[PDB]
Amino acid sequence: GPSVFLFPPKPKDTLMISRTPEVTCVVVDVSQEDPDVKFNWYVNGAEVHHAQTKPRETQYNSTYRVVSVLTVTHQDWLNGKEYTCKVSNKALPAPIQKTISKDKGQPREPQVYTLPPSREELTKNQVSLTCLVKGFYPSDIVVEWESSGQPENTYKTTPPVLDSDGSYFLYSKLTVDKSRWQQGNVFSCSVMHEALHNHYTQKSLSV
Amino acid sequence: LLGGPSVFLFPPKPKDTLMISRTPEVTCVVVDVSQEDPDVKFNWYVNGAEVHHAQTKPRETQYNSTYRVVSVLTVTHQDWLNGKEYTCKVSNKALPAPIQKTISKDKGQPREPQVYTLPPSREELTKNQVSLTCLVKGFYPSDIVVEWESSGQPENTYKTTPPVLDSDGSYFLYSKLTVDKSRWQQGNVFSCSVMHEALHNHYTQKSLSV
Amino acid sequence: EDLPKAVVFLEPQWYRVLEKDSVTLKCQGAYSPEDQSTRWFHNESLISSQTSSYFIAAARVNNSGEYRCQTSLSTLSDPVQLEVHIGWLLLQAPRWVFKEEESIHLRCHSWKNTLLHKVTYLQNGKGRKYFHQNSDFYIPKATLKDSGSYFCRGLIGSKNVSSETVQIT
Ligand SMILES: *[C@@H]1O[C@H](CO[C@@H]2O[C@@H](C)[C@@H](O)[C@@H](O)[C@@H]2O)[C@@H](O[C@@H]2O[C@H](CO)[C@@H](O[C@@H]3O[C@H](CO[C@H]4O[C@H](CO)[C@@H](O)[C@H](O)[C@@H]4O[C@@H]4O[C@H](CO)[C@@H](O)[C@H](O)[C@H]4NC(C)=O)[C@@H](O)[C@H](O[C@H]4O[C@H](CO)[C@@H](O)[C@H](O)[C@@H]4O[C@@H]4O[C@H](CO)[C@@H](O)[C@H](O)[C@H]4NC(C)=O)[C@@H]3O)[C@H](O)[C@H]2NC(C)=O)[C@H](O)[C@H]1NC(C)=O
Ligand SMILES: *[C@@H]1O[C@H](CO[C@@H]2O[C@@H](C)[C@@H](O)[C@@H](O)[C@@H]2O)[C@@H](O[C@@H]2O[C@H](CO)[C@@H](O[C@@H]3O[C@H](CO[C@H]4O[C@H](CO)[C@@H](O)[C@H](O)[C@@H]4O[C@@H]4O[C@H](CO)[C@@H](O)[C@H](O)[C@H]4NC(C)=O)[C@@H](O)[C@H](O[C@H]4O[C@H](CO)[C@@H](O)[C@H](O)[C@@H]4O[C@@H]4O[C@H](CO)[C@@H](O)[C@H](O)[C@H]4NC(C)=O)[C@@H]3O)[C@H](O)[C@H]2NC(C)=O)[C@H](O)[C@H]1NC(C)=O
Ligand SMILES: *[C@@H]1O[C@H](CO)[C@@H](O)[C@H](O)[C@H]1NC(C)=O
Ligand SMILES: *[C@@H]1O[C@H](CO)[C@@H](O)[C@H](O)[C@H]1NC(C)=O
């Protein structure tokens, strides 16, 4: 039968309040006949129709890709209410269901450090800032860079890795022109996560 | 059960493939083999070759009733990372096609991965434990090996990041070795060793201190 | 041009056949008016079976080539080609000459009639009609650019497997 892959809300979307988050439930691999499927979403067990859905997007395999949204309130998804997609199709003899919640457990504040450009890597073209986040959990983190007051371009991020004491860390790299750094400018590595000064912090650096 | 079995073929680990005199492997696992006595029979090639480089190691089964089989291949050094191809050509009664994967590949833009290590960061100095950092960038052969030493013992409780794709297309990565405040303020010499395909005798270390 | 030319009919209606399928050839036009004769012709040779049908239960490579049939009359049947490919899936077809319009009936054939999940047929990399279980693709009236490569992909339990190019113009 068809298959469903309950995706979770983007961390940045559920961190703070700027964009209302969604718990996307995607049902892929369904034929041109026997499509038409309904969704009985459960938020611990209360349905509630208010679960808008996307149109019958066709994919390069005739396969109808039905998609569905469920706007979950910003203040809830962090409590851990288990959200449940339930799909029933003529192709599936039995309905299939998928539920996901907070990456469970308990967290840890990730106090962050900003390691500077290494001395010898300066007598070369452009140089590299580093921002080390260490000791936290879960993996619903976001790292961004800022200069003066506008977000910076040239930056990449290392994925989280499991440390010795059951925690994750990453090394956010930012390449900047040696001319634009040696002379002196202010660069701030900001990070958002569910266990900080109300979802946010940032640490600056210069010389 | 059944459904037709499968094959997997991985390269050797980087330390064994680069450094001399460390016998580099090449294995062919055959998972999901079972019940009706389907047997072994391997045969490798490089583009035309010969056996003599394997002999299976019994029948791991454990849990899901599938007689699991794997065999090795003792590769050269001046040979691999140089051109050769490698095939496993497996075969079995229940599989109606002698199928097999190839490997080698990951090619292109090797160059100086001039490594840049770092000290702790100011505020780190309060907590009982601070972490030294070692960044590597300027290397494209996807994989690499990174280790740590302190005067001369394998410090076995650092942690290393997995490589990613930087801007220009040369991979970069990080490593983090945690030491107590006292050991870093003692003044011990720490070295971040790195081995990759494009280095003089394939090695580097940037001993760091305060 | 003398006697009516017999011809060769297939069982089933596919010629690209795999490595352990059953295939059965038979002949018409002809028929020994009282004591059924045959004289099947393999690759331009002879076989002893004397049956107005011809068995091949365990078909394998050596059973490909040209086949013909000449019963008592039957002039000389024009040749028919039989193909066997090793592998898992195939795109079994009746004809490969579809100009402007005729009937199209393709089968994404398995191996040892072992079922398939999530099979799809393809139009030069693009998909056209996906079904969940195994089934055939039928179309009447040609689409003037089915002229191209066709094949099919399927998932046997979990192993994902493809078939071979068949361009039909
Ligand atoms: C018909 O075509 C479509 C689409 O065609 C192709 O689409 C992609 C993949 C490209 O290759 C295109 O060029 C091409 O046209 C086919 O639909 C695809 O089907 C496969 C199934 O094999 C799905 O793979 C799954 O992918 C998810 C992750 O999905 C993200 O990444 C995809 C690839 O990068 C990307 O395409 C998706 O858009 C998606 O990206 C995220 O999307 C969400 C919302 O959709 C969005 O909010 C995010 O922001 C966005 N983020 C990013 C970075 O893109 C992956 O999770 C699946 O893994 C599950 O299954 C694996 C096998 O079992 C297993 O290894 C995994 O661990 C995981 O298993 C599950 O894990 C947890 C617990 O561990 C739990 O959920 C389950 O218990 C467990 N098991 C199961 C069974 O769920 C898997 O890798 C493609 O996403 C999907 N593409 C779609 C829908 O667009 C379709 O198959 C074709 N049909 C035929 C017959 O061929
Ligand atoms: C019955 O028996 C066992 C049960 O074991 C089970 O193992 C897991 C799944 C848990 O559930 C356990 O609880 C359980 O006991 C099953 O055997 C296993 O089956 C799985 C899949 O079913 C295989 O996974 C594959 O793993 C390879 C990589 O394998 C290394 O990493 C594994 C974990 O990541 C590790 O467990 C392996 O041992 C192996 O590790 C190597 O081991 C050798 C042996 O000594 C050692 O020398 C090496 O140093 C060591 N290396 C490392 C790094 O650990 C992975 O590559 C496979 O992914 C393929 O398929 C994916 C989906 O198709 C795809 O995303 C991947 O990219 C890759 O696909 C290929 O990728 C490239 C291009 O990207 C290309 O080659 C191909 O195009 C593409 N596709 C294909 C088809 O090749 C996959 O994840 C295990 O290897 C296997 N054996 C074990 C665990 O020992 C068995 O399947 C069970 N049967 C059933 C029906 O379930
Ligand atoms: C029939 O022809 C095919 C293809 O030319 C060939 O492979 C096969 O060997 C021939 N059969 C015999 C019995 O020689
Ligand atoms: C499975 O087949 C399809 C195309 O036939 C492709 O999308 C996918 O990469 C294939 N998997 C492997 C391992 O080749």
d(CA B177, CA B120): 10
Report how far Cα A46 is from the mean position of its chain's Cα atoms. Answer: 26
Domain closes at, from C71, C87, C103? C87
CB half-sphere exposure, B123, CA atoms < 13 A: 12
Claim to verify: residue C52 and residue C133 sit in the same structural domain: no
Close Cβ partners of C24 (under 8 Å, ≥ 6 residues apart): C11, C53, C54, C55, C56
| Inter-chain touch A171–B174, beta carbons under 8 Å | yes
Within a 10 A sphere around the Cβ of C74, how many other Cβ atoms? Answer: 23
First and final C-alpha spacing in chain A? 61
From the list A114, A154, A158, which residue is nearest B161 (CB)? Answer: A158
Cβ–Cβ under 8 Å, residues C156 and C114: yes
The CATH number assigned to the domain with range B105-210 reads 2.60.40.10
DSSP B87-150: B----BTTBSS----B-----S-------EEE---GGGGTSSEEEEEEEEEEE-SS--EEEEEE
Claim to verify: residue C1 and residue C82 sit in the same structural domain: yes
In this complex, the chains that touch A, judged by 3 or more CB pairs closer than 8 A, are B, C
Mutate to test the interface with B, among A131, A170, A171, A202 (most CBs of B within 10 A): A171
Rg of chain B in Å (alpha carbons) = 22
Rg of chain A in Å (alpha carbons) = 22
Strand C65-69 relative to strand C80-84, pairing: antiparallel
Token pair of B39 as six digits? 């047997």
Query: How many CB pairs (< 8 A) connect A and B?
Result: 71
Within a 10 A sphere around the Cβ of C153, how many other Cβ atoms? Answer: 18
d(CA A72, CA A101): 11
d(CA B9, CA B28): 5
Question: What is the enclosing helix (H) or strand (E) of A99?
Answer: strand A96-100
Quote the ligand 1 centre to A25 CA distance (angstroms). Answer: 11
Cβ–Cβ under 8 Å, residues B118 and A115: yes
d(CA B186, CA B170): 36
Close Cβ partners of C160 (under 8 Å, ≥ 6 residues apart): C153, C154
Chain A touched by B13 (CB under 8 Å)? no
Residues in chain B: 210
Residue type, A61: N
Within a 10 A sphere around the Cβ of A38, how many other Cβ atoms? Answer: 12
Q: Which of B140, B142, B141, B120 is nearest to B190 (CA)?
A: B120
Three-state secondary structure call for residue C23? strand
Three-state secondary structure call for residue B16? helix
Cβ–Cβ under 8 Å, residues A72 and A22: yes
Cβ–Cβ under 8 Å, residues A167 and A137: yes
| Cα dist from A191 to A76, B114, B146, whole Å | 21, 29, 28
Q: Which residue of A has its CA nearest to C131?
A: A31
d(CA C4, CA C1): 8
The verdict on the CB of residue C160 being under 6 Å from ligand 4 is yes
Close Cβ partners of B201 (under 8 Å, ≥ 6 residues apart): none
Claim to verify: residue C7 and residue C51 sit in the same structural domain: yes
| Inter-chain touch B3–C156, beta carbons under 8 Å | yes
What is the DSSP secondary structure assignment for residue A158, as one 8-state letter? P
d(CA A162, CA A137): 9
| Inter-chain touch B97–C88, beta carbons under 8 Å | yes
Q: Which domain holds residue C157?
A: 88-169
| Inter-chain touch B4–C87, beta carbons under 8 Å | no
Q: Is B135 exposed, middle or buried (0-12, 13-18, 19+ CB in 10 A)?
A: buried
Q: Which of A84, A102, A73 is nearest to A39 (CA)?
A: A84
| Inter-chain touch A111–B131, beta carbons under 8 Å | no
What is the DSSP secondary structure assignment for residue C164, as one 8-state letter? -
Question: What is the enclosing helix (H) or strand (E) of B15?
Answer: helix B14-18
Name the experiment that determined this structure: X-ray
b/e sequence B137-175, b meaning 16+ C-beta within 10 Å: bbbbbebbbbbbbbeeeeeeebbbbebeebeeebbbbbb
Tokens 């590299």 belong to residue: A128
The verdict on the CB of residue C158 being under 6 Å from ligand 4 is no
Kindly list the residues from chain C whose CB atom is less than 8 angstroms away from the CB atom of residue A59.
Answer: 127
Claim to verify: residue C92 and residue C80 sit in the same structural domain: no
Tokens 């195994």 belong to residue: C134
- Measured in degrees and rounded to the nearest 5, phi and psi for residue A180 equal -80, -10
Quote the ligand 1 centre to A4 CA distance (angstroms). Answer: 9
Chain B touched by A173 (CB under 8 Å)? yes
Chain C touched by A31 (CB under 8 Å)? yes
Cβ–Cβ under 8 Å, residues B169 and B109: yes
Claim to verify: residue C67 and residue C101 sit in the same structural domain: no
| Cα dist from A173 to A131, A162, A193, B99, C148, whole Å | 6, 19, 18, 43, 49
Report how far Cα B124 is from the mean position of its chain's Cα atoms. Answer: 32
Task: Give residue limits of the domains in chain B.
Answer: 5-104, 105-210
CATH number for A102-207 (one of 1.10.760.10, 2.60.40.10, 3.40.50.720, 2.60.40.3080): it is 2.60.40.10
Q: Is B198 exposed, middle or buried (0-12, 13-18, 19+ CB in 10 A)?
A: middle
Chain C touched by A29 (CB under 8 Å)? yes
d(CA A72, CA B131): 39
H helix runs in A83-197, sequence order? 178-182
Which among A28, A65, A83, A92 is the best mutation to test ligand 1's pocket, defined by most ligand atoms within 8 Å of the CB? A28
Claim to verify: residue C144 and residue C133 sit in the same structural domain: yes
Chain C touched by A93 (CB under 8 Å)? no
d(CA A154, CA A180): 13
d(CA A9, CA A24): 7
From the list B121, B162, B178, which residue is nearest A115 (CB)? Answer: B121
Cβ–Cβ under 8 Å, residues B180 and B149: no
- Measured in degrees and rounded to the nearest 5, phi and psi for residue B181 equal -50, -40
Rg of chain C in Å (alpha carbons) = 18
Work out whether the CA dihedral B122, B123, B124, B125 comes out positive or negative.
Answer: positive
d(CA A86, CA A42): 8
d(CA A178, CA A207): 13
What is the DSSP secondary structure assignment for residue B45, as one 8-state letter? B
| Cα dist from B18 to B13, B84, B140, B176, B195, whole Å | 9, 15, 15, 23, 8
Cβ–Cβ under 8 Å, residues A82 and A44: yes
d(CA C153, CA C117): 10
Total domains in the fold of chain C: 2
Chain A touched by B9 (CB under 8 Å)? no
Q: Which residue of C has its CA nearest to A64?
A: C130
Q: Is C87 exposed, middle or buried (0-12, 13-18, 19+ CB in 10 A)?
A: middle
Cβ–Cβ under 8 Å, residues A29 and C118: yes
Distance from CA of A68 to the nearest CA of C (A): 22
Tokens 């059953």 belong to residue: C22
Domain closes at, from C32, C67, C87? C87
First and final C-alpha spacing in chain C? 32
Strand-pairing partners, residue C8, are C27
Strand-pairing partners, residue A174, are A129, A155
d(CA A140, CA A7): 14
Distance from CA of B89 to the nearest CA of C (A): 14
Quote the ligand 3 centre to C63 CA distance (angstroms). Answer: 7
From the list C86, C157, C158, which residue is nearest B97 (CB)? Answer: C86
Q: Which of C85, C53, C87 is nearest to C67 (CA)?
A: C53
d(CA B40, CA B91): 7
Q: Which of A36, A32, A27, A38 is nearest to A3 (CA)?
A: A27
Close Cβ partners of B120 (under 8 Å, ≥ 6 residues apart): A113, A115, B130, B131, B132, B184
Distance from CA of A1 to the nearest CA of C (A): 6
Strand C80-84 relative to strand C16-17, pairing: parallel
Cβ–Cβ under 8 Å, residues C82 and C40: no
| Cα dist from B110 to A170, B136, B142, whole Å | 26, 14, 10
Residues in chain A: 207
Q: Which residue of A has its CA nearest to C121?
A: A61
Close Cβ partners of C97 (under 8 Å, ≥ 6 residues apart): C168, C169
DSSP A67-88: EE--B--TTTTTTTPPEEEEEE
Residue type, A97: Q
Q: Is B179 exposed, middle or buried (0-12, 13-18, 19+ CB in 10 A)?
A: buried
Cβ–Cβ under 8 Å, residues C92 and C109: yes
Please report, for the domain that includes residue C110, its CATH number.
2.60.40.10
d(CA C124, CA C47): 41
Mutate to test the interface with C, among A29, A32, A34, A61 (most CBs of C within 10 A): A61
Q: Which of C136, C128, C133 is nearest to C91 (CA)?
A: C136
- Measured in degrees and rounded to the nearest 5, phi and psi for residue B185 equal -80, -5
| Cα dist from B145 to B82, B118, B136, B168, B197, whole Å | 19, 18, 11, 21, 10
CB half-sphere exposure, B153, CA atoms < 13 A: 4
d(CA A96, CA A83): 14
| Inter-chain touch C130–A91, beta carbons under 8 Å | no
Cβ–Cβ under 8 Å, residues B130 and B176: no
- Measured in degrees and rounded to the nearest 5, phi and psi for residue B14 equal -65, -40
Chain C touched by B97 (CB under 8 Å)? yes
What is the DSSP secondary structure assignment for residue C157, as one 8-state letter? T
Q: Which residue of C has its CA nearest to A61?
A: C127
Residue type, A92: L
Claim to verify: residue C97 and residue C64 sit in the same structural domain: no
Mutate to test the interface with B, among A111, A119, A173 (most CBs of B within 10 A): A173
Claim to verify: residue C115 and residue C65 sit in the same structural domain: no
Claim to verify: residue C107 and residue C165 sit in the same structural domain: yes
d(CA C83, CA B18): 48
Close Cβ partners of C22 (under 8 Å, ≥ 6 residues apart): C56, C57, C59
Close Cβ partners of A201 (under 8 Å, ≥ 6 residues apart): A112, A190, A191
